[PDB]
Amino acid sequence: MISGLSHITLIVKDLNKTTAFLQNIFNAEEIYSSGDKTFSLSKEKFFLIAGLWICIMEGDSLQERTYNHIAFQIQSEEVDEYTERIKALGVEMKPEGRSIYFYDFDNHLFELHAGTLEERLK
């Protein structure tokens, strides 16, 4: 059986920029970094966000924006908080349980969700 989630890898054009993004918004915690353009090895980093192993690799950004997305959990008391924090990165946002939708610099639609599965159904 599938023990659970291993990790999630995203491709981005600028690793440095995306990193600040993950650090400013998700408080991502870089734990690994590799790569060497002069040795023809793509650069990539591993971050930890709320216990999840997130890998970022440098490459081409999604050529288009779709509604496929990854959503992280936040308390409903912090919606306004995270909404303003995101509005501050210049990134474009797409204006029960309240949710915040926004893209990174590579067309990856992310969401900050207030509310859980249990609530969702019940």
Place this chain on the structure above:
Amino acid sequence: MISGLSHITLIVKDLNKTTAFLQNIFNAEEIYSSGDKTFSLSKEKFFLIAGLWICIMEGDSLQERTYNHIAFQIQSEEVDEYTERIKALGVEMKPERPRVQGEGRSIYFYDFDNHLFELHAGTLEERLKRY
């Protein structure tokens, strides 16, 4: 701060066909179907795949293929069995990728909507154990 992962939402052209895919390969547990009620903004179903809340919505968006992927954990003793289960379903599988020491065995395959999936038999701990 972020409490954790809420869910992952994928967009597919054929919900019923994608559902079979998930239930067969990932033993996905369906816990919700917009069909369960009357009047639903869209055709969608929610599944539980190894703790994760996976949501599927029927749509037309068919993003290009990229190395953006989601990887689930498995044991290395199960790599053959999963390769067999995937082969049996006729789903496309990528060749083995080049790896550094401490990466672990992996299986890469797509669904029917350009969603690259991975079954990983390694651990982050073995990948950080080196300089």
